[PDB]
Amino acid sequence: DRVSAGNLRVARVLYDFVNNEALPGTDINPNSFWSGVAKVVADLTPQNQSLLNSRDELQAQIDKWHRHRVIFDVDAYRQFLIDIGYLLPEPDDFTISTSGVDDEITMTAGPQLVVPVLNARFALNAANARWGSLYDALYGTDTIPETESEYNKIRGDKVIAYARKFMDQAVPLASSWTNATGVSQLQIAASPEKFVGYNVLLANHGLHIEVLIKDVILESAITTIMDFEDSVTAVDADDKVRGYRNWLGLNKGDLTEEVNKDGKTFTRVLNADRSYTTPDGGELTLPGRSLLFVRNVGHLTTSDAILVDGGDGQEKEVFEGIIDAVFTGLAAIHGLKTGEANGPLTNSRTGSIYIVKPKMHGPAEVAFTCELFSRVEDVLGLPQGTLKVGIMDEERRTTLNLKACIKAAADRVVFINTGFLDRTGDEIHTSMEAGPMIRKGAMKNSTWIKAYEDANVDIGLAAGFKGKAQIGKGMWAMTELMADMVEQKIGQPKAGATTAWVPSPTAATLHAMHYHQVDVAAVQQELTGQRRATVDQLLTIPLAKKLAWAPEEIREEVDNDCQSILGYVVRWVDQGIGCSKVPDIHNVALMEDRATLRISSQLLANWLRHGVITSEDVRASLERMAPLVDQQNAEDPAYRPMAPNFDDSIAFLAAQELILSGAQQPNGYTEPILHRRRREFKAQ
Ligand SMILES: [Mg+2]
Ligand SMILES: [Mg+2]
Ligand SMILES: [Mg+2]
Numbered sequence: 001d002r003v004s005a006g007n008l009r010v011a012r013v014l015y016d017f018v019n020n021e022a023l024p025g026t027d028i029n030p031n032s033f034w035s036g037v038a039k040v041v042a043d044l045t046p047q048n049q050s051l052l053n054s055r056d057e058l059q060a061q062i063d064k065w066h067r068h069r070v071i072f073d074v075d076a077y078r079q080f081l082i083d084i085g086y087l088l089p090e091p092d093d094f095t096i097s098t099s100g101v102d103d104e105i106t107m108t109a110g111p112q113l114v115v116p117v118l119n120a121r122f123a124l125n126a127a128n129a130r131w132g133s134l135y136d137a138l139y140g141t142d143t144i145p146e147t148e149s150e151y152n153k154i155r156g157d158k159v160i161a162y163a164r165k166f167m168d169q170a171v172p173l174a175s176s177w178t179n180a181t182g183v184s185q186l187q188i189a190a191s192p193e194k195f196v197g198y199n200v201l202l203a204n205h206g207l208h209i210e211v212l213i214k215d216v217i218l219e220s221a222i223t224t225i226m227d228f229e230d231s232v233t234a235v236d237a238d239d240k241v242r243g244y245r246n247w248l249g250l251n252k253g254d255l256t257e258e259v260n261k262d263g264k265t266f267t268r269v270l271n272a273d274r275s276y277t278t279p280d281g282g283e284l285t286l287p288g289r290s291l292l293f294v295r296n297v298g299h300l301t302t303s304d305a306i307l308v309d310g311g312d313g314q315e316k317e318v319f320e321g322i323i324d325a326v327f328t329g330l331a332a333i334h335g336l337k338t339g340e341a342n343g344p345l346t347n348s349r350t351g352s353i354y355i356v357k358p359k360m361h362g363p364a365e366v367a368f369t370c371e372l373f374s375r376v377e378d379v380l381g382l383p384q385g386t387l388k389v390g391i392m393d394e395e396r397r398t399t400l401n402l403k404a405c406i407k408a409a410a411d412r413v414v415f416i417n418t419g420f421l422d423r424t425g426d427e428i429h430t431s432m433e434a435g436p437m438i439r440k441g442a443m444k445n446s447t448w449i450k451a452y453e454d455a456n457v458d459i460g461l462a463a464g465f466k467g468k469a470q471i472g473k474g475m476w477a478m479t480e481l482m483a484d485m486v487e488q489k490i491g492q493p494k495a496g497a498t499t500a501w502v503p504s505p506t507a508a509t510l511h512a513m514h515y516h517q518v519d520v521a522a523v524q525q526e527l528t529g530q531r532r533a534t535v536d537q538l539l540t541i542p543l544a545k546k547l548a549w550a551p552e553e554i555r556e557e558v559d560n561d562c563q564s565i566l567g568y569v570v571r572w573v574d575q576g577i578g579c580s581k582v583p584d585i586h587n588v589a590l591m592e593d594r595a596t597l598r599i600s601s602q603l604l605a606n607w608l609r610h611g612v613i614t615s616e617d618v619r620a621s622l623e624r625m626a627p628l629v630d631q632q633n634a635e636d637p638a639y640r641p642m643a644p645n646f647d648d649s650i651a652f653l654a655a656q657e658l659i660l661s662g663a664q665q666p667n668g669y670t671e672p673i674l675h676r677r678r679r680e681f682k683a684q
Contacts, residue, residue, distance in 0.1 A: 008034065044372060045311055045312075058085070062084075107206060109498040117246050118243050128289065131217050136215075185279070205520070218509050220508040239576065251334040273285050274288050297359075352414075356415075361667070373389065394420070394421075417501075424443050435610055437542055476502060482506070485510060554613065562625045566642070601662045
């Protein structure tokens with residue numbers, strides 16, 4: 001069940017999906033498509049492999065360098081990084097030129113949702129999360145404490161009062177909103193231009209508020225990243241094709257999903273755009289859906305969805321990132337076109353497609369991404385420059401060369417984002433040989449992470465992002481702890497981030513309040529010109545000093561890390577579920593994703609390498625945490641317990657192998673082990 005398409009031996013499920021579902025309506029001759037795809041693969045594969053080899057070669061050099069330099073000669077270290085080509089010169093100041101970009105990205109500051117593309121139900125909700133009920137968000141979360149079955153009026157009243165107080169912040173009266181006796185320029189029984197329409201529609205900081213006359217709706221997830229990478233499990237052509245079909249469906253605009261509850265079924269569909277009467281009596285139409293990005297995989301992994309003849313290989317698995325650019329690009333044409341075969345809805349209003357590119361190391365790797373995109377646009381007949389790139393700043397070689405990384409994509413970049421979880425994973429792996437690292441929770445307060453976050457913004461603004469491309473920060477992982485999020489996450493817009501990552505539609509609605517409270521444009525303007533971080537700060541390796549930890553602190557870290565690896569991996573391996581809510585050793589429900597795994601496994605691998613803990617301690621902790629995870633999953637009938645037969649569980653062995661072999665994984669990446677182990681489970 002592979003179709004010969006010249007040099008490509010394509011899994012039929014993929015071949016049929018492309019020819020039967022994706023190609024018609026694109027005006028791309030099917031034979032030209034496969035031939036052109038063959039050629040991109042032939043031409044770009046050697047450079048892809050070469051880039052990966054450079055990764056390994058640099059890491060080998062750093063490992064060796066630390067063998068005797070074990071401490072700290074900062075100057076010698078820095079000059080070594082220069083000599084080996086790890087740290088490259090900063091180019092001169094420039095301004096990005098990226099154009100054809102939507103207003104959601106250039107003009108608006110607000111939340112950005114990330115969702116697993118493989119889950120249609122979740123994807124649909126994510127795309128529809130552009131608008132959400134503040135009342136539902138308040139009532140349904142701990143943002144309104146339970147202090148002091150059916151609706152509860154004493155809660156609803158707190159909800160109403162909270163929204164009222166929010167109204168006084170975002171759309172202030174001339175002379176609280178509470179005292180309003182009714183509404184009719186708008187009148188209530190400060191800035192009159194914040195009345196934009198009715199069907200009552202208000203705008204503050206470029207974001208809409210709708211008061212139903214009853215409820216307050218907030219424009220919430222302005223943009224949404226449909227994720228093929230860390231939040232999904234996709235290890236073969238079957239899984240990939242599920243992902244590509246959902247993405248195709250979102251871009252056609254006809255993705256639907258049946259939802260059955262309480263003996264009733266409703267079909268989930270995409271929301272229409274929203275019409276209003278303007279105050280002059282004219283018409284206004286606003287987007288009903290989040291502007292969609294897609295997160296492709298990075299440069300590392302290969303996929304047997306296509307096996308390749310020619311070049312330097314023998315039926316070589318194709319590079320996954322290459323095929324993601326092709327197939328996510330192809331599907332996204334329908335989100336730009338308006339013919340009969342292209343579905344009822346479009347995504348961009350401006351002729352762009354937005355791909356998030358993760359896990360890139362350094363400017364050559366950004367240049368290669370841009371060439372891939374260029375070659376794909378050629379095969380697809382999209383104008384050059386249509387595939388715009390969201391750059392994840394989440395690898396040390398990228399952070400340290402960030403200005404050159406942006407310049408390498410100056411014509412295509414629509415964001416940068418501090419993917420802080422991967423970035424910490426890379427920090428640990430890169431300096432693995434330097435000595436034992438501080439605890440995961442100490443990393444938050446480290447010199448390097450502070451310079452990483454600040455540099456990103458500075459370099460962004462210095463490259464002229466204000467008004468042209470987002471500057472983003474990272475995910476809030478604690479899904480039930482929304483009072484904490486409303487309290488803490490205001491820090492990101494206050495730091496000049498025009499966007500930050502949220503885990504669900506409800507979190508998007510609550511985080512949107514922060515952008516009403518903080519004028520991110522003015523914050524960005526006050527940041528303009530400032531230089532708040534240094535290369536020497538970034539190069540401060542977060543090594544633990546001696547006598548850093550009482551033995552209980554060591555033990556708390558180990559169990560916490562093992563429980564989190566196990567809770568996430570067991571669902572990954574046994575169920576093919578890539579984004580799980582997993583309760584830590586302190587109880588709290590977290591969004592675990594592959595990057596959370598990278599951090600935990602690398603920290604443990606580092607502690608093992610330097611004798612902070614033993615192999616025996618690791619096994620012991622894993623065995624102790626297994627049944628806790630089994631217990632957490634008990635009410636799920638699809639779950640199979642890991643205990644007591646730990647060595648018969650592929651999931652368990654996968655968690656063990658991530659830690660015990662963690663030091664040998666390229667840059668600490670979890671895919672080689674996880675992909676291997678998921679395939680093993682499927683074939684069992
Ligand atoms: Mg369409
Ligand atoms: Mg649209
Ligand atoms: Mg990441």
